Design a protein around this motif. Structure first.
Motif, PDB file in Angstrom:
ATOM      1  N   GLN K  76     -19.068  11.633   9.614  1.00 41.22           N
ATOM      2  CA  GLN K  76     -19.463  13.011   9.861  1.00 41.22           C
ATOM      3  C   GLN K  76     -18.351  14.003   9.556  1.00 41.22           C
ATOM      4  O   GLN K  76     -18.556  15.211   9.712  1.00 41.22           O
ATOM      5  N   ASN K  77     -17.186  13.530   9.116  1.00 37.21           N
ATOM      6  CA  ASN K  77     -16.130  14.396   8.616  1.00 37.21           C
ATOM      7  C   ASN K  77     -16.158  14.515   7.099  1.00 37.21           C
ATOM      8  O   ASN K  77     -15.180  14.976   6.504  1.00 37.21           O
TER       9      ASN K  77
ATOM     10  N   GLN L  47     -12.545   8.994   2.046  1.00 37.74           N
ATOM     11  CA  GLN L  47     -12.470  10.378   2.487  1.00 37.74           C
ATOM     12  C   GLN L  47     -11.294  11.121   1.878  1.00 37.74           C
ATOM     13  O   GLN L  47     -11.482  12.233   1.357  1.00 37.74           O
TER      14      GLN L  47
ATOM     15  N   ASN M  58      -9.501   8.191  15.052  1.00 44.07           N
ATOM     16  CA  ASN M  58      -9.994   9.545  15.280  1.00 44.07           C
ATOM     17  C   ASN M  58      -8.973  10.631  14.973  1.00 44.07           C
ATOM     18  O   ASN M  58      -9.317  11.604  14.283  1.00 44.07           O
ATOM     19  N   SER M  61      -8.485  11.059  11.062  1.00 46.19           N
ATOM     20  CA  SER M  61      -9.563  11.769  10.385  1.00 46.19           C
ATOM     21  C   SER M  61      -9.591  13.255  10.711  1.00 46.19           C
ATOM     22  O   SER M  61      -9.761  14.080   9.797  1.00 46.19           O
ATOM     23  N   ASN M  62      -9.416  13.626  11.983  1.00 46.23           N
ATOM     24  CA  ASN M  62      -9.436  15.048  12.310  1.00 46.23           C
ATOM     25  C   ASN M  62      -8.312  15.819  11.631  1.00 46.23           C
ATOM     26  O   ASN M  62      -8.544  16.932  11.136  1.00 46.23           O
ATOM     27  N   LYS M  65      -9.129  16.370   7.899  1.00 41.63           N
ATOM     28  CA  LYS M  65     -10.129  17.403   7.652  1.00 41.63           C
ATOM     29  C   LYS M  65      -9.628  18.806   7.950  1.00 41.63           C
ATOM     30  O   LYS M  65      -9.984  19.736   7.214  1.00 41.63           O
TER      31      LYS M  65
ATOM     32  N   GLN O  76     -10.998  15.799  20.006  1.00 40.06           N
ATOM     33  CA  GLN O  76     -12.210  16.440  19.518  1.00 40.06           C
ATOM     34  C   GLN O  76     -12.136  17.958  19.578  1.00 40.06           C
ATOM     35  O   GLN O  76     -13.095  18.627  19.182  1.00 40.06           O
ATOM     36  N   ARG O  79     -11.223  20.349  15.661  1.00 39.53           N
ATOM     37  CA  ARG O  79     -12.109  21.085  14.768  1.00 39.53           C
ATOM     38  C   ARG O  79     -12.466  22.440  15.365  1.00 39.53           C
ATOM     39  O   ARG O  79     -13.260  22.532  16.302  1.00 39.53           O
TER      40      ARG O  79
END
Lengths: 79, 79, 79, 79, 79, 79, 79, 79, 79, 79, 79, 79, 79, 79, 79, 79, 79, 79, 79, 79, 79, 79, 79
Positions: K76-77, L47, M58, M61-62, M65, O76, O79
Motif C-alpha cells: 500500500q506504499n 518499491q 515498516n 518503507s515509510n 516513501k 504510522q 505519512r
C-alpha cells in the motif's frame, strides 16, 4: 394418556418393577409381627424382608445419582 | 428462469451445498432431545451436530467478507 | 416516445440492466430480516446481498466519472 | 393475536414444550413431601424429579447462549 | 402532518417496526424479575429477551452505518 | 422587499428547503441525548439524524461548486 | 468578560452541562470506596458511576470529531 | 433537588427497590445468629437470607454490565 | 446413500465403534440386577460396567470439544 | 492471429503468468473445504492459498496503476 | 513438475516438515485408545500427543498471519 | 554514420546515459517479483526501483519541455 | 563494476546495513522452532526476533516513501 | 531411527524413566495377591505399591498440563 | 564479535539476566522429583519453582508486546 | 573569487542559511535510528526532524517559483 | 552554541520537559522488577509507570503530526 | 505611525481579530496538558481548542487566496 | 523535591493510602502464624487479612486499567 | 554466593524456618516407634507430631498458591 | 488511634463479640478437667463447651468466605 | 404489610408449614423426659420425635441448596 | 467371538480367576450345613469359607474403584 417420564424416571421404574411386590410383602410382614412380637418365625421373616428392602432402596438411589452426574458433565461442554 | 446470483452468492452457495443436510440434521436432533433431555446418546449427538453447525457458519461468513474486501480495493484504483 | 439519453446514461443503464433484480432482492431480504433478526440463514443471505449491492454501486460511479473526465479533456483542445 | 417471538424464544419454547408437565410434577412432589418428610417412596420420587428439572434448566440455558453467540458474530462482519 | 424522514430513518424505522413489541417485553420482564430475583422461569425468560434485544440493536446500527458509507462515496465523485 | 438572490443561492435554498426541519431535529436530538447519554433509543435516533445531516451538507456543497465551475468557463470565452 | 468560545466548544459545553455533577459524583464514590474496598453497596455504586462516566466521555469525543470533519470539507470547496 | 441519575443508575435502582428490605433482614439475621450460633432455626433462616442476597447481587451486576456493553457499541458507529 | 458426516462426527463414531457393545452390556446388566438386587456377583458386574460406561462418555466429550476449539481458532485468522 | 495487447496488458499478463496455477489451486481448495469444514489440514491449506491470492491481486493492481500514472504525465507535456 | 508454491506456503511447509510424523502419531494413539478407554498408559500418551498437536497448529497459523500482515503493508506504499 | 541528433535529443540522451542500467534493473526486479509475490526483500527492492524510475521519467520530461519553451520565444522575435 | 544505485536505494541500503544479520537470525530461529514447537525459550526468542523484523520493515518503507514524496514536489515546480 | 519426540513427551519420559520398574512391580504384586487374598504381607505390599502408582500418575499429568498452559500463552502474543 | 541485538531483545535479556539461574533450578528440581514422587519436601520445592517460572514467563511476554505496540504507532505517523 | 549568483539563488541561499544545520541533523538522526529501529526516543526525534525538513523544502521551492513568475511578466511588457 | 531547533521540535521538547523524569522512572522500575517478578508492589508500580509512558508517547506523536498537517496546507496556497 | 497595510492584510486582520484569544488559549491548554497527559478533562479541552485552531487557519488561508485570484484577473484586462 | 507523578499514579496512591497499614498487618500475621500453624485464632486472623489483601489488589488494578482505556480513546480522535 | 530465590520461595522459607525442627522430630519419633509399636507414650507422642506436620504442610501449600493467584492477575492487565 | 479494619474484619469481630467469653470458658474447663479426668460433671461441662466452640469456629469461617466470594465477582465486571 | 420473601424462602416456608407442630412436640417431649429419664414410654416417644426432626432439617437444607445452585448457573450465561 | 472387555473388567476377571472355585465351595458348604446344623466340623469349615468369600469380595471392589478414580482424573486434564 401417560404423564411425562424421562430417563432417570425410567431407571427408577426399572428398579421398582424388577422388585415388584416387596413393598406389600414388607407391609404385611410388619402387620403380622405387630400382633405377636414373640413368634421366632415371624421375627426371622421380618428380618429378611427388611434387609431386602434396605438394599434395594440404597442401590436405586446410588444408580440414579451416578447417571445424573454423568449427564450434567456433557452439558457443560456446550460452551 | 433463475434469479440473479453473483460471485459472493456463488461462494455462499458452494458452502451451503458442500454442507448439504446439516440444517435438517440439527433440527431433528433438537426435536429428539427436547422430548427426553436426559438420554446421554442424544446429548452426545446434539453436541457434535451443534459444534459442526457453529464451525460452518463462522467459516462461511469469514470467507465471504475476505473476498468482498479483496474486491472493493481494485475498484478504488479506477480513478 | 423515449426521453433523451446520452452516453453516460447508457453506461449507467448497462450497469443497472446487467444487475437486474438486485434492488428487489435486497429489499425483500431486509423485509424478511427485520421480522426475525436472529435467524442465521437470514443473516447470511442479507450479508451476501448487501455486499453485492455495495460493490455494484461503487463500480458504477467510478466508471461514469472516468468516462466523463476522458470526455472533458478533448473538448478543451478546441481552442 | 400473538405477541412477538423470535428465534431464541422459539428454541426456549421448544425446550419448554418438549418437557411439558415437569414443572407441575415437581411442584406436586414437593407439596406431597413437605407433609411427611420421612416416607422413602416420596423421597425417591422427589430426588428423581429434582434431578430431571436441574438437567433440563442447564441444557436450555447453554443452548440459548450458544445460538446467541453464533449470531452475534455474523453481524460484526457487516462493516 | 408528518415530520421529515429520510432513507436512513426509513431503514431504522423498518427495523423498529419489524421488531414491534420487544422494548415493552424487556421492560415488563425486568419489572417482574426485580421483585423476585430467584425464580428460574423468570431468569430464563429475562435471559432470552435480553439476548434478542442485544442482537437487534447491533444489527440495526451496523446496517445504518453501511448504507451511510455507501452514500458518502458517490457524492465525492461530483467534482 | 426581498434582498438579492442569484442562481447559486437559489440552488442552496432548494437544498435547504427540501430538507426543511433537519436542523431543528438534530438540535433537539442532541438536547435530549446530553441529559442521559446511556439510553440506547436516544443513541440510535441521534446516530441516524447526524448521518442525514452529514450527507446533506456534503451534497449541497459539491453541487454549488460544480455549478460555479461550469459558469466560470463560459465567461473566459468572451475574449 | 467571557473568553472566546466557538461551535465545537459549545457542543463540548452542552455535553458537560447536560451531565452536570457526574465528575464530583465519581470522585466522591472513589473516595468512599478506597477506605473500605469490601462493601458490596460501595462496589455496586462505583461500578454504575464508572460506566456512566465512560459512556459520556466516548460520546462527547465522537460527536466533536464528526462535526469537525463535516466542517473541514466545505472549506476545501472554496478553491 | 435530586442529584443526577442516568439509565444504568435507574436499572440498579430498580433492582435495589424491587428487593426492598433484604439488606436490613440480612443484617438482623446475622445479629441474631452471632449471639447463639447453635440454634437450628436461626441457622436455617440465615442460610436462606444469605442465598437470596448472593443471587440478587450477581443478577444486578450482570444486567448492568450487559446494558453498558450494548451502549458502548452504537457509539463507535458515529465515525 | 449415507447422510452427511464430518470430522467431529467421525471422531465420535471412532469412539462409539471402538467401544462396540458396551451399551447393550450395561442395559442387560441393569435388567438382570433389577430382578434380584442382592446377588453379589450381579452387583460386582454392574459396578464394573457402569464405571466403564462413565469413563468412555467423559473421554469422548472432552476429545470432541478439544478438537472443536482447535478448529475455531484457525478460522478467526482469515481476517 | 492474436488480439491487440499493449504495455499495461503485458504487465498484467506478466503477473498472471508468473503466478500460473494459483487460481485453480484456490478453486480446488475451496471445493475440498466446503465438503468437510472441520478438517484442520484443509483449514490450514485454505488459509495459506487465500492469503497468497490476496497479496497477488493487490500487488498487480498497484503496479498497473503506477505505470498508468507515469504515462499520463509525459503526454500532458506535448502542449 | 511441482505445482506453484509461494512464501507463505513455504513457511507452512517448514512447520509441517519440522513436525514430521505427529499427524500419524495422533491418529494411531486415538485408534489405540478408542478400543480400551481405561488404560492409564494409553490415556497419558494420548494427552501428550493431543497437547503437542494443539500447540503446533496454533503456532503455525499465527506465524502465517503475521507474515501476511507484514507483506500487505509495503504494497500500500506503492501509490 | 550516426543519424541526426539535436539539442533536445542531446539533453534526453544525457539523462538516459546518466541513468544507465535502471531500465534493465526494473525489468529484472519485476521478473523476479512476479514469480513469488510474497517475499518482503523482493517487495522492498521493487518499491525502491519503481520510485527511482518514476522520478527519472518526470525530471527528464520537464527539463525537455522547459528548454523547448525557452527556444520557441527567441524565434518569434525575428519579425 | 557496481550497478546503478540512486538516493532511495542508498536509504534502503542504509537500513539494510544498519540491521545487518536480522534476516539470517530470523531464518535460524524459525528453523529451530519448527522442530520443537513447545520449548518456551525458543518461543520467546522467536517472538523477539519477529517483532524486531516487523518494526524494521515498516520503518524502512515509510522513510522511503516520505523521501520520494518530498522529491516529486520540487519537480512539478519546473513549469 | 527414533520417532519424533518433543518437550512435553520429554517431560513425560523423564517421569516414566525416573520411576523405572513400578509398572512391572504393581503387575507382579497383583498377580501374587489374586491367588491368596488373605495373606497380610501381600496385602501390605500391594497397598504400598498401589499408593506409589497413584501419586506418580497424578504428578505426571499435572506437570504436563502446567507446561502446556505456559506454552499456549506466549504464542497468542504473536499478533 | 556479537550478533545483532535490538531494544526488544535487550528487554528480553534484562528479564533473562535478572532471573539468572531459575531455568537450571527448575530442571534440577524436576530431575530430583521424578525419582521419588512422594517426598513432601521435594513436592513443595517443585511447586514453588514452577510457580516462579510461570510468573516470569508471563511478565516477560507481556512487557515485550506492550513495547512493540508502543513502537508500531509512532511509525504510522510518518505519512 | 566567487561564482555568479543572482536573485533567485540569493533567495534559495537565504533559506539554506536560515536553516543552517538541519541537513546534518537529519543525516545523523537516520544514522542513529537505522542501528536500533525500536527505541522510542530515536523514533520521536526522527519524526520531528523529518517533518521540519519536509516543510522547509516545500516553502523554499514555492517562494522561488513565485518570484520567478513575478519576474517573467514585467519582461513581456518590453514590446 | 545551540543546534538548530524549530517549532515541531519545540513542541516535542515541551512534552519531553513537562514529563521530566518518567524515562528514568520506567527504567528503574523495570530494573527492580526483573530481579523479583513476583512482588505485587513491584508489579503494581510497574503497571502504573508503563501506562503513563504509553499515554505520553501517543499524545506527543499525535500533536506533532496535527501541527505539521496544519502547516503543510498554508504553503500550498502560495501558488 | 502605522506601517502599510492593504486589502489582503485587512482580511487577514479581520480573521485574526474576530478570533481574538485562541492562540493564547491553545498555548495555555498545551502547557497544562504536557504536565499531566492523563487527565481526561485536559484531554477534552485540548481536543476542542486544537480543532478550532485548525478550522480557523484553513478558512483564513482559503479566503485570502480567493480574493487574490479575483484581483489578478481584472489587471490582465488592462491590455 | 518530589519525583513526577501523574493521574494513574495518583489513583494508585489513593488506593494505597486509603488502605494504609494492611501490608504490614499481613506481614505480621504471617510472621506470627509461621511459628505455630495450629492456633485457630491465628488461622482466623490470617484468613481475614489475606482476603482483604486480595480484594484490594484486584480492585486497584481494574480501576487503573479502566481509566487508562478511557484515556487512550480520546487521543485517537486527534487525527 | 546464594542461588536465586524469589517471593514465593521466601514465603515457603518463612514457613520452613518458623517450623524449624519438626521434620527431624517426626523422623526420630517414627524411628523410636517402629521398634516398639505398643508403648502408649510413644503412640501419643507420634500422634501429636504427625498432626502438627500435616497442618503445617497444608497451610504452607495453600498460602503459596493464593499469593501466586494474586500475582497472575495483575500481569494480565498489562495489555 | 485504631488500626485499620475492613468489612470482613467487621464480620469476624461481630462473631467474636457475640460469642464473648467462650474462649476463656473453654480454657478454664480444660484446666479443671486435666487435674481430675474422671469426674463426670467435669466431663459433661467440657463436652458442651467444646461442641459450642467447634460450631462457632465453623460458622465464622464459612460466613467470611461467602462474603469474600460475593465481593470478588462484582470487581471482575469493571472491565 | 408483609416483609419481603423470595423463592428460596418460599421453599423453606413450604417445608416449615408442611411440618407444622414438630418443633413444639420435640420441645414438650424433652421437657417431659428431663423430669424422669427412666420411663420407657417417654424414651420411645422422644426417640421417634428426635428422628423425625433430624430427617426434616436435613431434607430442607439439601433442597434449598440444590435450587440455589440451579439458579446461580443461568445467571452466568448472561455474558 | 468374545464380547467386549476393558481394563476394569480385566482386573475383576483377574480376581475372579485367581480365586477360582471359592463360589462353588461356599455353595457346597452351605448345602451340607443346612442338613445338619449341629456338626462342629461342618460349622468350622463353613466359617472359614464364609470369611474367605467376604475378604475377596471387599478387596475386589476396592481395587476396581481405586483404578476408576485414577482414570477419571487424567481425562479432566484434556481441557
Amino acid at each position: 394418556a401417560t404423564p411425562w417420564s424421562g430417563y432417570l424416571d425410567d431407571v427408577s421404574a426399572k428398579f421398582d418393577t424388577g422388585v415388584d411386590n416387596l413393598q406389600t410383602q414388607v407391609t404385611e410382614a410388619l402387620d403380622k409381627l405387630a400382633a405377636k412380637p414373640s413368634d421366632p418365625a415371624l421375627l426371622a421373616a421380618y428380618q429378611s424382608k427388611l434387609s431386602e428392602y434396605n438394599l434395594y432402596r440404597n442401590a436405586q438411589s446410588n444408580t440414579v445419582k451416578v447417571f445424573k452426574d454423568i449427564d450434567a458433565a456433557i452439558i457443560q461442554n456446550f460452551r
